[PDB]
């Protein structure tokens with residue numbers, strides 16, 4: 001009777017299913033959430049009179065069709081097109097080199113070029129139909145507004161670390177962007193993975209390699225599965241043998257099946273439209289005082305910074321620097337940003353061992369946290385490096401833990417305390433000159449959220465034994481040289497978001513935050529908003545499957561160990577405006593100059 005169905009019964013038309021306004025994760029090219037409010041109250045149609053659109057949506061009829069007879073050769077996977085999200089991946093931003101590189105299309109493309117030494121060629125029929133954009137005058141959604149009125153309450157009850165936790169669930173549900181224009185259409189793509197040596201000799205006839213790749217596309221679609229082709233003349237007998245992989249996908253329209261005339265495919269584009277391109281803006285662009293009218297002025301510029309910080313923390317994590325050049329040695333497969341760490345010489349370093357101390361700040365009774373958090377060296381004894389080494393700091397933070405008393409008088413009431421314990425986690429560095437023995441070996445780390453790539457499980461190898469360093473992490477270590485020399489990998493040092501390692505620039509801003517030359521860096525155990533890394537040189541830690549995207553949240557949910565401070569008056573000093581909250585938690589109205597002076601006396 002109201003909403004969509006009133007416009008749909010009166011008009012008898014389909015609804016356009018390619019709509020903007022929704023969110024967009026930009027690492028994994030997936031769509032999620034609904035940021036903008038789409039209401040169908042005026043019963044608008046497209047100017048064709050064929051679909052039904054929302055009110056705050058205007059369409060531009062493209063009615064365009066592209067048909068190319070040549071494939072485009074896309075070697076060197078570091079710069080690639082996405083064919084569905086090319087306009088939103090290549091924005092001018094500081095993280096343009098990480099966009100798109102966790103989507104499902106990229107992790108397939110990167111694997112087939114390294115595991116086969118291949119290049120890729122796509123050929124496509126584009127069929128762009130509309131361009132669907134949002135108006136500038138537009139309001140936020142009903143559910144997206146509610147979760148910004150919860151970030152702005154924790155920031156005014158003086159609860160940081162809970163407002164950071166809710167701004168990292170905001171990015172989990174609504175992505176990093178908001179699509180502001182989509183493109184309803186339907187492509188038809190064929191990707192081939194040719195062998196890379198097949199292109200190097202055909203420098204002149206590279207225009208004939210692609211001319212047969214675009215003719216093998218049209219014989220696959222037009223003729224049936226039975227080979228009645230017209231392309232097998234001279235060179236489409238090595239081309240069939242030099243290829244390593246082939247697939248054909250369709251994005252809109254009727255489902256593709258091999259042998260369907262290109263006439264018959266293009267008559268199913270109607271009523272089956274998808275976004276074959278999209279553009280967008282960042283997520284914190286839409287947190288501003290004219291999208292949120294009832295909140296105060298400078299309070300939504302602080303929500304916009306808390307949500308901006310959680311997007312930049314989701315791109316700083318999921319960034320793997322390493323040697324990207326494929327023909328070189330020290331090629332890191334998991335790396336998705338070039339570091340310049342190729343062609344470097346390595347130096348074998350020896351490390352003393354890690355240790356850790358606890359302090360047990362608050363809850364000295366009923367919970368004893370300084371047993372689980374404490375760890376000694378395996379080769380020294382107490383909390384110290386051995387004789388020829390030196391300690392560095394690497395991290396220091398607080399481990400909270402809730403418990404329960406129960407004071408019975410039968411009536412009983414229970415009190416919920418919290419027990420804190422600050423832990424400091426050192427590691428040792430070879431100072432001047434150490435002989436070849438008298439040092440622990442290394443067998444890789446494994447956290448509780450990860451695995452050791454020596455044994456492909458959460459376990460140290462044979463002969464090795466773990467020792468705890470950051471309340472979940474286990475460093476596999478053995479002191480032997482006959483039975484533990486098979487699983488030993490050379491070690492380059494820990495560093496963090498604060499303290500870089502001193503093993504770069506030898507014989508020594510403290511230092512840089514990177515590995516020495518020839519070593520690859522790997523993340524291990526993000527521990528409350530700061531990640532610690534470690535440098536190795538194996539090639540076994542390098543290989544394997546590509547890592548999935550590490551989704552937020554990264555902080556554990558806090559234990560509410562901070563009291564709330566009720567804020568009433570909000571002001572800025574530079575234009576003399578004030579927003580006085582009324583009684584019984586109603587709203588934020590603007591402050592008249594006769595009531596704020598009567599309200600500052602009860603504050604301070």
Ligand SMILES: *[C@@H]1O[C@H](CO)[C@@H](O[C@@H]2O[C@H](CO)[C@@H](O)[C@H](O)[C@H]2NC(C)=O)[C@H](O)[C@H]1NC(C)=O
Nearest residue numbers: 155156157158159160161561562563564565566
């Ligand atoms: C607002 O919250 C912050 C964060 O907890 C408080 O800052 C800390 O307060 C404790 C209380 O003694 C101090 O020990 C810390 O040194 C403070 N940290 C910093 C960085 O200042 C702050 O006190 C709270 N403000 C109010 C009015 O409650």
Ligand SMILES: *[C@@H]1O[C@H](CO)[C@@H](O[C@@H]2O[C@H](CO)[C@@H](O)[C@H](O)[C@H]2NC(C)=O)[C@H](O)[C@H]1NC(C)=O
Nearest residue numbers: 195197198199200201202237238239240241242
């Ligand atoms: C991969 O491509 C190479 C071309 O770079 C093919 O090598 C040629 O194959 C033809 C087939 O008769 C020979 O006559 C040529 O002498 C080969 N060499 C060159 C330099 O052209 C190779 O055959 C292809 N791979 C497969 C498995 O067929």
